[PDB]
RNA sequence: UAAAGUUGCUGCAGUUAAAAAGCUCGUAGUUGGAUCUCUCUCGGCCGAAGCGUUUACUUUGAAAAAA
């Protein structure tokens, strides 16, 4: 990213998988950004806001996708404990 | 009474001394103590004001202070107030042989008599009443190492308030930080 | 048989970090591997880890940060000088940039940039990045 | 998968597993008092012995060994230890 | 959910699903559903966990709100005892359903007539509707399921553990997550029931039609 | 592995954590000591001592109640066997082998099993050997076998 | 000589392209699990004779014909 002068020097800075955190390519097709509605805590509804989480596509080949999407939503307070 | 090997006295080790003798005057133990003996006795701030003191054993005498381990400590927790009492036999570290040495370890060092088998003693006799039934050392990110021990639950409640003691008497006189919890299984 | 400790270590930590585990159990344990993982850990790599104590060897349970792309060992622990230092980092790390390769000196077992700071050579244990 | 936890098992998983490939290995065997209405005394019995054990107040067969647990007569109270 | 007592699950949701027969599954188990079942019967069934159907029914809910175009959402049926629930759904939620035989390059082949590029997709059953799941590895498509104890979980990206065989099953999970998305979205309210009930979703033998005339 | 056979066994002793006497054990040291010494004297192995000594007594393992192991109680007694037990009973399975070899000669399995076994013999006295367990000329024979069994 | 990673220590191959001995045992060879954190004297803030068991390793120093 930067060179000695401290400028950044990357074409743009590729996003990573929420689930292994590897980075995922420009020609991953089968990787998803997935967004998950936060809803208001009194009234149950959207709220507007949402918790975005990056799977790879071999983290879903794998069929770990499920597994790691409800375990970022249970860290972020979306899923219930147990 | 208190034989130390240095040949000096203390006046804390003479406090504690007297408090054995009165236990050897009046008691159901007085035929257990008056062979049994001391070497050494220290007072160690734990935390916030709270205080606790280790006696030091002989390692023959350990396992015969340990079959009147809980009924002596109880005696001084009541003699000395709100203070914690453990007793921690007076175990020697000698150093590692290194190239550069002379003449005082003519013979092989016994593993006993080593700084690893030394504090695994000391942990082990610092909780005597409960035994040791796990250990976990965990490194944190920065290096450091903290220990976790797990202890057995069939007399919890006995040691379960001593815990934030045997950690402070632990980093006094080992210098490493452990940490005490219960496990679910032994 | 099993030989190379720390061989078998380092290729569980790599098979693991392949497959995107968040942790990996290392049986038995050693100096040099508590060693190895901790030069890894100081530099980010694997995150903190924890020592099981049985009472015949350790194992370790690490925790995988998904920032390793290999650890290996390098069998037989050639003996490094500083002078063969640059020819080894030109053989096994993948830049300039990053990457280290461990070597166990009488100094400690550490990475090469701190072997060259404490000027002096070794034995290399291996290489991560 | 992905995300099992190594350093705390279930005790029902830790337990499924061979009793060396356990976490921390224990053994699946135990020790038992067993007492004999004909006895006035208890005994200290293995759970796999691999001997016959006679009574210490009779002379009745105790345990007969076998493949693995060996097998106590019928009558004889036995008791888990620990 | 998130411990969201508004979200909680209610007497009536659990009755509907016991009726349903949601919790029960099948007898063979995929090693990625393992986490949702709660315990296998004395004749091989696993028993589905009702407590993670709901958590999983509610995070698919949140997935498929957060697309502000509803017709972004494709709700998929191969299966005729779920065609009728898809249609249902889309027709509630502004989704686009297709309900039939799924082409191959809908997804894909920009050129084909059915060609569309959905937001997210949704599913009937996994193993009866492999062919979009696949596509949906080719488009950067999130994917959402209705998976039975047996259903494989690639390219699954939020399963739904519930019975998906039965015609009650399928019919009341597609009902209720229909119920879930509106009320996230703000029509319809979260204190009476909704006016409209499972039976319309679920799917009727044609000789069920034929004794109903 | 095996050593001589192609199986990968695992099974074997897995020892507790714990390295105390059990609470049930209400045997001193002494006690132990004097039980091992009149199994000993009876004539059992201290592989058999061990063993009808956890499966009768309660000693779960002599080595955390007495603090020493069988064998070395047995040396400090001095009621040890010349020999090692697990190289004696090589010895005894060897000369048995050969005893059946002799009535049996077409037996090739019997042949190649021996060869094993000798093989086996050959390296527990060259291991005794360096540890200095055997005198340094003790040499296994043909012919002087079966006097050592 | 490089190309030749077609001699492969770096760094090759050996199911079918050339190729694992028919199969074990076995000596030399090669390889080998965890573990152990600086003292008597002399010319009162010094100086040392050392045997601390050594070796490998590493670093330094000396010495080492120019061309």
């Given at each position: 990213?930067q060179?000695?002068?401290?400028?950044f020097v990357?074409?743009?800075?590729?996003?990573?998988?929420s689930?292994?955190?590897?980075?995922?390519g420009?020609?991953?097709?089968?990787?998803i950004?997935?967004?998950?509605?936060?809803?208001?805590?009194?009234t149950?509804?959207?709220?507007?806001?949402?918790?975005?989480?990056?799977?790879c596509?071999?983290?879903?080949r794998?069929?770990?996708?499920?597994?790691s999407?409800?375990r970022?939503?249970?860290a972020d307070?979306i899923?219930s404990?147990? | 009474?208190?034989?130390?090997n240095?040949?000096?006295?203390?006046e804390?080790?003479?406090?504690?001394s007297?408090?054995?003798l009165?236990?050897?005057?009046?008691?159901?133990?007085?035929?257990?103590?008056?062979?049994?003996?001391i070497?050494?006795?220290?007072?160690?701030?734990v935390?916030?004001?709270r205080?606790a003191?280790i006696?030091?054993?002989p390692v023959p005498?350990?396992?015969?202070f340990?079959?009147?381990?809980?009924?002596?400590?109880?005696?001084?927790?009541?003699?000395?107030?709100?203070?914690?009492?453990?007793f921690i036999?007076?175990?020697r570290?000698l150093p590692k042989?290194?190239?550069?040495?002379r003449?005082?370890?003519?013979?092989?060092?016994?593993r006993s008599?080593?700084?690893?088998?030394?504090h695994?003693?000391?942990?082990?006799?610092?909780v005597f009443?409960?035994?040791?039934?796990?250990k976990?050392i965990?490194?944190?990110?920065?290096g450091?190492?903290?220990?976790?021990?797990?202890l057995?639950?069939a007399?919890?409640?006995?040691?379960?308030?001593?815990?934030?003691?045997?950690?402070g008497?632990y980093?006094?006189?080992?210098?490493?930080?452990v940490?005490?919890?219960?496990p679910?299984?032994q | 048989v099993?030989m190379?400790?720390?061989?078998?270590?380092?290729?569980?930590?790599?098979?693991?970090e392949?497959?995107?585990?968040?942790?990996?159990?290392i049986?038995?344990?050693?100096?040099?591997?508590?060693?190895?993982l901790?030069?890894?850990?100081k530099h980010?790599?694997?995150?903190?880890?924890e020592?099981?104590?049985?009472?015949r060897?350790?194992?370790?349970?690490?925790?995988?940060?998904?920032?390793l792309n290999?650890?290996?060992?390098?069998?037989?622990?050639?003996?490094?000088?500083?002078?063969?230092?640059?020819?080894?980092?030109?053989?096994?790390?993948?830049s300039?940039?990053?990457?280290?390769?461990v070597?166990?000196?009488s100094?400690?077992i550490?990475?090469?940039?701190?072997?060259?700071?404490?000027?002096?050579?070794?034995?290399?244990?291996?290489?991560?990045? | 998968?992905?995300?099992?936890?190594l350093?705390?098992?279930?005790?029902?998983?830790?337990?499924?597993?061979?009793?060396?490939?356990?976490l921390?290995?224990?053994?699946?065997?135990?020790?038992?008092?067993?007492?004999?209405?004909?006895?006035?005394?208890?005994?200290?019995?293995?759970?796999?012995?691999?001997?016959?054990?006679?009574?210490?107040?009779?002379?009745?067969?105790?345990?007969?060994?076998?493949?693995g647990?060996?097998?106590?007569?019928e009558?004889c109270?036995?008791?888990?230890?620990? | 959910?998130?411990?969201?007592?508004?979200?909680?699950?209610?007497?009536?949701?659990?009755?509907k699903?016991?009726?349903?027969?949601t919790?029960?599954?099948?007898?063979?188990?995929?090693?990625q559903?393992?986490?949702?079942?709660y315990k296998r019967?004395?004749?091989?069934?696993?028993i589905?966990?009702?407590?993670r159907?709901?958590?999983?029914?509610l995070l698919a809910?949140?997935?498929?709100?957060?697309?502000?175009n509803?017709?972004?959402?494709?709700?998929?049926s191969?299966?005729?005892?779920?065609?009728?629930?898809?249609?249902k759904?889309?027709?509630?939620?502004?989704?686009?359903?297709?309900?039939?035989?799924?082409t191959?390059?809908?997804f894909?082949?920009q050129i084909?007539?059915?060609?569309?590029?959905?937001?997210?997709?949704?599913?009937?059953?996994?193993?009866?509707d492999?062919?979009?799941?696949?596509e949906?590895?080719?488009?950067?498509?999130?994917?959402?399921?209705?998976?039975?104890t047996?259903?494989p979980?690639?390219?699954?990206?939020?399963?739904?553990?519930?019975?998906?065989?039965?015609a009650?099953?399928?019919?009341?999970?597609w009902?209720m997550?229909?119920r879930?998305?509106?009320?996230?979205?703000?029509?319809?309210?979260?204190?009476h029931p909704?006016?409209?009930?499972?039976?319309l979703?679920?799917?009727?033998?044609?000789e069920?039609?034929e004794?109903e005339? | 592995?095996?050593?001589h056979?192609?199986?990968?066994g695992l099974?074997?002793?897995?020892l507790?954590?714990?390295?105390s006497?059990?609470t049930?054990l209400?045997?001193?040291?002494?006690?132990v000591?004097?039980?091992?010494?009149?199994?000993?004297?009876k004539?059992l192995?201290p592989?058999?001592?061990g063993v009808?000594?956890?499966?009768?007594?309660g000693?779960?393992?002599?080595?955390?109640?007495?603090?020493?192991?069988?064998?070395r109680?047995?040396?400090?007694?001095?009621?040890?066997?010349?020999?090692?037990?697990?190289?004696?009973?090589?010895?005894?399975?060897?000369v048995?082998?050969r005893?059946?070899?002799?009535?049996?000669?077409?037996?090739?399995?019997?042949?190649?099993?021996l060869?094993?076994?000798?093989?086996?013999?050959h390296?527990?006295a060259?291991?005794?050997?360096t540890?200095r367990?055997?005198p340094?000329?003790?040499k296994?024979?043909?012919s002087?076998?079966?006097?050592?069994?």
């Amino acid at each position: 990213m930067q060179n000695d002068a401290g400028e950044f020097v990357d074409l743009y800075v590729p996003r990573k998988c929420s689930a292994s955190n590897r980075i995922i390519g420009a020609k991953d097709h089968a990787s998803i950004q997935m967004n998950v509605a936060e809803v208001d805590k009194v009234t149950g509804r959207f709220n507007g806001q949402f918790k975005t989480y990056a799977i790879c596509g071999a983290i879903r080949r794998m069929g770990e996708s499920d597994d790691s999407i409800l375990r970022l939503a249970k860290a972020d307070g979306i899923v219930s404990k147990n | 009474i208190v034989k130390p090997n240095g040949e000096k006295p203390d006046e804390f080790e003479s406090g504690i001394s007297q408090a054995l003798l009165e236990l050897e005057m009046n008691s159901d133990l007085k035929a257990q103590l008056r062979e049994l003996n001391i070497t050494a006795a220290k007072e160690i701030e734990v935390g916030g004001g709270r205080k606790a003191i280790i006696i030091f054993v002989p390692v023959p005498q350990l396992k015969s202070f340990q079959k009147i381990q809980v009924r002596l400590v109880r005696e001084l927790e009541k003699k000395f107030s709100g203070k914690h009492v453990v007793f921690i036999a007076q175990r020697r570290i000698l150093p590692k042989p290194t190239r550069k040495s002379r003449t005082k370890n003519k013979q092989k060092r016994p593993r006993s008599r080593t700084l690893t088998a030394v504090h695994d003693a000391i942990l082990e006799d610092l909780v005597f009443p409960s035994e040791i039934v796990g250990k976990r050392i965990r490194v944190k990110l920065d290096g450091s190492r903290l220990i976790k021990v797990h202890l057995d639950k069939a007399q919890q409640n006995n040691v379960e308030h001593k815990v934030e003691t045997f950690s402070g008497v632990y980093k006094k006189l080992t210098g490493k930080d452990v940490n005490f919890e219960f496990p679910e299984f032994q | 048989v099993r030989m190379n400790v720390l061989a078998d270590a380092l290729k569980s930590i790599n098979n693991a970090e392949k497959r995107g585990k968040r942790q990996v159990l290392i049986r038995p344990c050693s100096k040099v591997i508590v060693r190895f993982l901790t030069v890894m850990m100081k530099h980010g790599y694997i995150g903190e880890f924890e020592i099981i104590d049985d009472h015949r060897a350790g194992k370790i349970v690490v925790n995988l940060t998904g920032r390793l792309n290999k650890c290996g060992v390098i069998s037989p622990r050639f003996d490094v000088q500083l002078k063969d230092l640059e020819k080894w980092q030109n053989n096994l790390l993948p830049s300039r940039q990053f990457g280290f390769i461990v070597l166990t000196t009488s100094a400690g077992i550490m990475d090469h940039e701190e072997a060259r700071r404490k000027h002096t050579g070794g034995k290399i244990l291996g290489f991560f990045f | 998968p992905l995300a099992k936890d190594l350093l705390h098992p279930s005790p029902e998983e830790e337990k499924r597993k061979h009793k060396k490939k356990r976490l921390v290995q224990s053994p699946n065997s135990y020790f038992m008092d067993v007492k004999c209405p004909g006895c006035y005394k208890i005994t200290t019995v293995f759970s796999h012995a691999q001997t016959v054990v006679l009574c210490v107040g009779c002379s009745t067969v105790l345990c007969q060994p076998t493949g693995g647990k060996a097998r106590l007569t019928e009558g004889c109270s036995f008791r888990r230890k620990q | 959910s998130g411990a969201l007592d508004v979200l909680q699950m209610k007497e009536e949701d659990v009755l509907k699903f016991l009726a349903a027969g949601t919790h029960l599954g099948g007898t063979n188990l995929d090693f990625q559903m393992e986490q949702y079942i709660y315990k296998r019967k004395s004749d091989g069934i696993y028993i589905i966990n009702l407590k993670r159907t709901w958590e999983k029914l509610l995070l698919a809910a949140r997935a498929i709100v957060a697309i502000e175009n509803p017709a972004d959402v494709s709700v998929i049926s191969s299966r005729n005892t779920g065609q009728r629930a898809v249609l249902k759904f889309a027709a509630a939620t502004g989704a686009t359903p297709i309900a039939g035989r799924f082409t191959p390059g809908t997804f894909t082949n920009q050129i084909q007539a059915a060609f569309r590029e959905p937001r997210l997709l949704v599913v009937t059953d996994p193993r009866a509707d492999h062919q979009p799941l696949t596509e949906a590895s080719y488009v950067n498509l999130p994917t959402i399921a209705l998976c039975n104890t047996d259903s494989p979980l690639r390219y699954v990206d939020i399963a739904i553990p519930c019975n998906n065989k039965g015609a009650h099953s399928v019919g009341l999970m597609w009902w209720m997550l229909a119920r879930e998305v509106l009320r996230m979205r703000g029509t319809i309210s979260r204190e009476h029931p909704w006016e409209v009930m499972p039976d319309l979703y679920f799917y009727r033998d044609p000789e069920e039609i034929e004794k109903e005339e | 592995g095996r050593m001589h056979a192609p199986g990968k066994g695992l099974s074997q002793s897995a020892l507790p954590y714990r390295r105390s006497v059990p609470t049930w054990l209400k045997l001193t040291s002494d006690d132990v000591k004097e039980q091992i010494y009149k199994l000993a004297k009876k004539g059992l192995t201290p592989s058999q001592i061990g063993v009808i000594l956890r499966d009768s007594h309660g000693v779960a393992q002599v080595r955390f109640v007495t603090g020493n192991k069988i064998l070395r109680i047995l040396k400090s007694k001095g009621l040890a066997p010349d020999l090692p037990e697990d190289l004696y009973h090589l010895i005894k399975k060897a000369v048995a082998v050969r005893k059946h070899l002799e009535r049996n000669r077409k037996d090739k399995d019997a042949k190649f099993r021996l060869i094993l076994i000798e093989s086996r013999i050959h390296r527990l006295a060259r291991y005794y050997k360096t540890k200095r367990v055997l005198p340094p000329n003790w040499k296994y024979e043909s012919s002087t076998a079966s006097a050592l069994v």
